[PDB]
Amino acid sequence: LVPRGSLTHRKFGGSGGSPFSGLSSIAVRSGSYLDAIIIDGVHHGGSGGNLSPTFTFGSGEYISNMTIRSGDYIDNISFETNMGRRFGPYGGSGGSANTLSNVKVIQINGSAGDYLDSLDIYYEQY
Amino acid sequence: LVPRGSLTHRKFGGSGGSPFSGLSSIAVRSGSYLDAIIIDGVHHGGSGGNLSPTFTFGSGEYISNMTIRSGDYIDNISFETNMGRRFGPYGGSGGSANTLSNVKVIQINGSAGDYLDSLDIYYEQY
Predict the structure, then answer these.
(1) Does residue A118 contact residue B121 with C-beta atoms inside 8 Å?
(2) E strands, chain A, where?
(3) Beta strands in chain B (DSSP E)
(4) Mode of pairing for the β-strands spanning A74-81 and B86-91
(5) Which of A81, A113, A118, B35 could, after both became Cys, cross-link B29 (CB 3.0–4.6 A)?
(6) Are A90 and A78 in contact (CB under 8 A)?
(7) Contact A119/B13, CB-based, under 8 Å?
(8) Which ranges of the sequence are coiled-coil (chains A, B)?
(9) DSSP secondary structure code for residue B17 in this structure
């Protein structure tokens, strides 16, 4: 239901230096819903609820497992990394829980106004 | 040469708010090579060369066309958005030029030390 390899990637350059991701850090604001997600310090959403600590990924550390509870809004977020570190759960208990398992999260896009309306998570599936 | 839909995405939540990307802004430092790329204000690379202006994507604006010249390093970067805005060319003239055409760039990962060694660009191909 989309052409094969229409979501893809390509590497340019050589083998030197240390790995980094454009997805460098995450924090959220939350109550019973998600108010905001903050990606690399950039705010996405409202100023309600409570600010989490910032989770900063190490070089070669990435989200390997993620649980989102959602409906018309993001209700809860938690994740785990390949190096065993956990973030959350942050948020409340309403909505359907869905889990990404044994992945490498590449990107988090989404939409937000005063609250966190939706996330669109791009990931490799192992 | 990887399973089908092993690089994928999934949407959570509803239809409200304004779109955002985790890939929010880009600037580079450059001379004849790429010294650094700066993604959402996060520095990746060295402190040599000259700092470009920061390119900030509008809601629903994304890189649709990208030219990278590279070898063992990133030598040149330029891009265009779906809304017609251009960034670069920044860098020098050594290496092989490769173009991504009619895409939507999702993520820029890579590796860097004192210079920008490699980029790994994740994108939809239209």
Answers:
(1) no
(2) 7-13, 18-20, 25-30, 34-39, 42-45, 50-51, 55-56, 63-70, 74-81, 86-91, 96-101, 103-112, 116-125
(3) 7-13, 18-20, 25-30, 34-39, 42-45, 50-51, 55-56, 63-70, 74-81, 86-91, 96-101, 103-112, 116-125
(4) unpaired
(5) B35
(6) yes
(7) yes
(8) none
(9) S
**Resolution to 1 decimal place, in Å:** 2.0
Q: Tell which A residues from 62 to 121 touch B, by Cβ distance under 8 Å.
A: 68, 70-74, 98, 100, 106-113, 115-121
Q: Which of B13, B17, B44 lies at the smallest CB-CB distance from A70?
A: B13
CA B89: distance to chain centroid? 12
For residue A37, the distance in angstroms to the closest alpha carbon of chain B comes to 10
Q: Are strands A63-70 and A96-101 parallel, antiparallel or unpaired?
A: antiparallel
Method: X-ray
Edge-to-edge strand list for the sheet holding B116-125: A7-13, B116-125, B103-112, A18-20
In chain B, what residues touch A121 (CB-CB under 8 Å)? 9-12
Shortest distance between the Cα of A124 and any Cα of chain B, in A, equals 4
CA angle B105, B109, B115 (to 5 degrees): 120
d(CA A107, CA B126) in angstroms, rounded, equals 19
Domain ranges for chain B: 23-126
The CATH number of domain A23-126 is 2.100.10.30: yes
Which 8-state DSSP code applies to residue B95? S
